[PDB]
Ligand SMILES: CC(=O)N[C@@H]1[C@@H](O[C@@H]2O[C@H](CO)[C@H](O)[C@H](O)[C@H]2O)[C@H](O)[C@@H](CO)O[C@@H]1O
Ligand SMILES: CC(=O)N[C@@H]1[C@@H](O[C@@H]2O[C@H](CO)[C@H](O)[C@H](O)[C@H]2O)[C@H](O)[C@@H](CO)O[C@@H]1O
Ligand SMILES: CC(=O)N[C@@H]1[C@@H](O[C@@H]2O[C@H](CO)[C@H](O)[C@H](O)[C@H]2O)[C@H](O)[C@@H](CO)O[C@@H]1O
C-alpha cells in the first residue's frame with residue numbers, strides 16, 4: 001500500500017484554479033482519493049497504478065490534469081495542459097497505459113516535473129518525500 | 143449546459159461510506175464536479191455525457207459507483223455495486239459508452255434506480271427535479 | 285493529544301442539513317477541526333476543551349449545534365437545537381464553560397445523547413469508541 | 427443579506443497552511459460558512475456581523491486568523507497572527523466586538539490588509555469586489 005499526499009499551492013492571484021475531477025486507474029487493486037488535513041491523498045493497492053486530478057480556472061479559460069503514481073516501485077508524475085474539452089482526467093489518466101508519449105512520462109519515474117500552457121503559465125509537481133510507502137508532493141500553480 | 147446537484151443521505155450507522163472518486167466522461171464538451179453547499183454538482187457542456195461518484199466503506203468491505211448524466215436530453219442514472227478492485231469510477235463511467243449491459247441502463251433515462259449488494263444493503267438514486275437544465279437528485283445509502 | 289472523529293449520518297431524505305460552522309474552545313492549548321477521509325476530526329491539546337459543529341437545513345428552517353469534548357479525561361457531548369439566529373456554534377461552544385445547564389451537560393461525560401427540535405426531528409451523538417486518545421462518534425440526523 | 431466569497435492563494439511551498447476553524451459572529455441574524463466551487467462563502471443576515479477563518483501550518487509552527495465582515499454597510503477585514511494556543515478563531519472573532527484594538531480594525535472598513543508574523547511571512551486580504559451585497563476577496567498566504 002502506497003499513499004501520495006498532495007499539497008496544492010496557487011501562487012498568483014491571477015485567475016483561480018478549482019478542483020473538478022479525481023480519478024483512479026485500475027491496476028494494482030486500484031486506489032482511492034481522500035481529502036486529509038487539507039491535502040489530496042491518493043492511496044494505491046500496490047505498485048503499477050496512478051490517480052489524476054483536474055483543475056479548472058474558468059476566469060481565464062485554463063486547466064490542467066496532474067497525474068501521480070508508482071511505476072516499478074518508483075513514484076512518477078506528469079502534467080497535461082492545453083486541454084480540449086474532451087480531455088477530462090478520466091481520459092488523461094488512462095493514456096499513461098497505452099499511449100507511447102504518456103507511457104514514457106510514467107517510465108521516467110520523475111520526482112519533479114513542469115509544463116507551461118499556451119498562455120505562459122507554468123505548473124509543477126515536486127515530490128518532497130520521494131521514497132517509502134507514504135510519499136508527499138507539492139502541486140504548484142504558477 | 144446541464145447541472146445535476148446531488149444530496150447524499152447516508153442512512154445507516156452500520157459501516158461508513160466515504161467519497162473516493164469523481165469522474166467526467168468526455169462527450170458533450172465534457173463536464174466538471176463541484177462541491178456546493180454540501181452537495182455534489184455535476185456540470186456538463188450538453189447532452190450525451192455523464193459523471194460518476196464512487197463511495198467505499200472500508201469497515202465493511204462495501205463500495206458502489208453512482209452515475210448521473212443526460213442522454214438524448216433526458217436525465218439518466220445507474221448504480222453499480224459488488225465491485226472488484228479493478229472497477230474504479232474511471233472504469234465504470236466509461237463502460238456506459240460501449241458496454242451493452244451499461245449502455246442499456248443509460249438509454250433507460252431513469253428518474254430513479256435502486257439496487258442491493260450481496261450483503262443486502264440498498265442504494266438508491268431519486269431525481270427530485272426531472273426536467274430542465276438544472277436537475278436535482280438524492281443519493282440514498284441504505 | 286485527543287482526536288474525536290465524527291461520521292455524519294443523514295437518515296431521511298426530508299430536508300437537507302449542510303455544515304456551516306466549526307469552532308474550537310480555548311482551554312487545554314485549544315484544538316483544530318480537520319476533514320479526514322469523509323469525517324470531521326476534532327484534535328485537542330489535552331483534556332478540558334471541546335469543539336462544535338453547526339448544521340443547517342434551509343429547506344425546512346432547521347438547525348443544530350453538536351459539541352464534542354473531553355472533561356476530566358472522559359469524553360462528553362451535547363446537541364442544542366431550536367436555535368435562534370443569534371445561536372451560532374461560536375456562541376454555543378462557549379456556553380459549556382459558564383452556563384450552569386450547559387456546564388452540567390459537559391459534566392455528564394455522556395457516550396451518547398439525543399434531543400428533538402420543535403418540529404419533531406431527533407438528533408443524536410453516539411460514541412463508538414469511548415476510551416483512549418482516538419475517539420470516534422456517529423452524528424445521526426433523524 | 428450579504429455574501430463574501432473568498433479565494434485562498436497559498437503562494438509559498440515552504441510550510442503548509444490548512445483550514446482548521448470557521449466561526450460566525452451572532453449579530454445581524456448571524457451567518458454561515460459554505461464551500462462553493464473551491465471558495466469559502468460567508469453569508470450574513472445583515473450588516474454588523476462577521477466570520478473568521480483560522481489556518482495552521484504544523485510543519486513550521488505558524489498560524490493566523492482571517493476575519494471578514496460588514497460594518498455600517500461597508501465591508502471590513504483583519505488578520506491576526508503570532509497566535510497563542512488559546513487564540514482560536516472562536517476567541518478572535520468575538521474580540522472584534524468588545525476589545526478596543528480589534529474594534530478599531532473593524533471600524534476601519536478596509537478593502538485590503540496585510541501583516542507579517544515574527545518569522546517574516548506575509549498574509550494579505552484583498553477585496554476584489556468592494557461594493558454591493560455580494561463581495562469578493564482574495565486571501566493570500568505569502
Ligand atoms: C510492479 C509494477 O509497478 N508493475 C507495473 C505493472 O503494474 C501491474 O499491472 C498488472 C496488470 O497489468 C496488475 O494490475 C498488477 O497488480 C500491477 O502491479 C503495469 O502493468 C506496467 C505498465 O504496463 O508497468 C509495470 O510493469
Ligand atoms: C444529444 C445526445 O444526447 N446525444 C448522445 C451522444 O452524445 C454526443 O456524442 C458526441 C460524440 O459521439 C459528442 O460528444 C456530442 O457532443 C454529444 O452530444 C452519445 O454519443 C450517444 C451515446 O450512445 O448517445 C446520444 O446519441
Ligand atoms: C483535566 C480537565 O479536563 N480539566 C478541566 C479544565 O480544563 C483545563 O482548563 C484550564 C484553564 O481553566 C487549562 O486550559 C487546562 O489546560 C485545561 O486542562 C476546565 O477548565 C474545567 C471546566 O471549568 O473542567 C476540568 O477541570
Ligand SMILES: CC(=O)N[C@@H]1[C@@H](O[C@@H]2O[C@H](CO)[C@H](O)[C@H](O)[C@H]2O)[C@H](O)[C@@H](CO)O[C@@H]1O
Pocket residue numbers: 452453454455472473474475496497498499523
Ligand atoms: C448596521 C450595522 O452595521 N450596525 C452595527 C451593529 O450591528 C447590529 O448589532 C445589533 C446588536 O447590537 C444587531 O445584531 C443588529 O442586527 C446589527 O445590525 C454592531 O452592534 C456595532 C458593533 O460596534 O456596529 C454597528 O453599529
